[PDB]
Amino acid sequence: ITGTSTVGVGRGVLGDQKNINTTYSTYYYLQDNTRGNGIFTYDAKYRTTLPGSLWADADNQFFASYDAPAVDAHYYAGVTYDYYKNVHNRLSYDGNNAAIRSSVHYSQGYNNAFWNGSQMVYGDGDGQTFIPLSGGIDVVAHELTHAVTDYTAGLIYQNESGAINEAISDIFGTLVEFYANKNPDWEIGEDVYTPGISGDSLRSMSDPAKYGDPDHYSKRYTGTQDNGGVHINSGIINKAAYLISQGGTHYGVSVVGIGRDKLGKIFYRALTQYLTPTSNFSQLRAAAVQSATDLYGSTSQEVASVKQAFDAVGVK
Ligand SMILES: CC[C@H](C)[C@H](N)C(=O)N[C@@H](CCCC[NH3+])C(=O)O
Ligand SMILES: [Ca+2]
Ligand SMILES: [Ca+2]
Ligand SMILES: [Ca+2]
Ligand SMILES: [Zn+2]
Fold first, then answer.
1. SS3 for the chain, per residue?
2. 160 annotated to bind ligand
3. How far apart are CA 93 and CA 61, in angstroms?
4. I want to staple 12 with a disulfide (CB 3.0 to 4.6 A). Which of 55, 72, 141, 205 is the partner?
5. Is 231 a catalytic residue?
């Protein structure tokens, strides 16, 4: 909508107060004009018609329970835009400041979130498995990173390329969580998963097997469930990424960690310069080796650690 840029205040899903960029024209809308061609947040009103209505508020105060998922979807999309711009010199998901659109209150009791090819979509959860899923910065950044991947490598959402697609969303969703720096971790979705259970998450990058996901190529899923295991086999790549950043010894293979910034540069380069729609795990290793060689040199520690990490998870 056409109007003047404003600053509202509200509370997110976990009860934290934050300022949000709005636009005033009769109502205050969740329209952030400060980032690219805008960040726009919509109310799906418990239905599945998308996007729904651009979020309108009478007084620019967003403290209602019903407001919270919108506050977080809007705010965390801004954090994720800032990460890509500040850390990787990428302007929105398409690299040309595309508008970032999110809908909250999707369906009833919907225990998931997704990128639909055009926008982000967040369920409210059923209050047992999940609370509103935009409450997790790693969840928001994971979904927006699907848009980045779709515009760049274009990894097909099935089998190994799909598992890479999912791992890249977990890797950057985690790196965005560290960028914002509010008790960040290497776990996925801990802030919105199982409110009645302390300390768990949907997936773990540090130990995928904690939640039954494979942490070695020899344990890869080869059936048809989950588009050939895209959320399962991601654990093999998430473990490799965790080892490149943090180091460790896994199945007797030692990896020297090179830290999160270098992990992010190597994988952002692989995603944007080397991976293709059909890349498999072996081709990801080659892409990450070539990216680290470009950035640091063929005989660098960073290249050595990339090879060490893929060797540790059984990817040749
Ligand atoms: C990043 C977390 C987000 C929920 C994402 N869409 C996801 O990983 N979803 C998978 C896990 C199950 C979600 C709850 N039913 C999925 O299999 O869709
Ligand atoms: Ca209000
Ligand atoms: Ca996390
Ligand atoms: Ca929990
Ligand atoms: Zn995903």
1. CCCEEEEEEEECCCCCEEEEEEEEECEEECEECCCCCCEEEEECCCCCCCCCEECEECCCEECCHHHHHHHHHHHHHHHHHHHHHHHHCCCCCCCCCCCEEEEEEECCCCCCEEECCCCEEEECCCCCCECCHHHCHHHHHHHHHHHHHHHCCCCCCCHHHHHHHHHHHHHHHHHHHHHHCCCCCCEECCCCECCCCCCCCCEECCCHHHHCCCCCHHHCCCCCHHHHHCCCCHHHHHHHHHHHHHCEEECCEEECCCCHHHHHHHHHHHHHHHCCCCCCHHHHHHHHHHHHHHHHCCCCHHHHHHHHHHHHCCCC
2. no
3. 29
4. 72
5. yes
Looking at the fold, whether 194 and 136 belong to one and the same domain comes out as no
* Domain termination residue (choose one: 110, 132, 154): 154
Cα 134 to ligand 4 centre (Å): 15
Residue (of 178, 167, 174) closest to 188 by Cα position: 174
User: Which residue range(s) make up the domain with 32?
Assistant: 6-154
Gap from CA of 120 to ligand 5 centroid (Å): 11
| Contact (Cβ atoms closer than 8 angstroms) between residue 30 and residue 40 | yes
This structure was determined by: X-ray
Cross-strand partners of 253: 250
Q: 13: Cβ below 6 Å to ligand 1?
A: no
Which among 142, 168, 202 is the best mutation to test ligand 1's pocket, defined by most ligand atoms within 8 Å of the CB?
202
Resolution (A): 1.5
In angstroms, rounded to a whole number, what is the distance separating the alpha carbons of residues 201 and 296? Answer: 34
Angle at the Cα of 98 from the Cα atoms of 42 and 226, rounded to 5 degrees: 70
Of 154, 169, 185, the one marking the end of a domain is 154
User: How many distinct structural domains can be found in the chain?
Assistant: 2
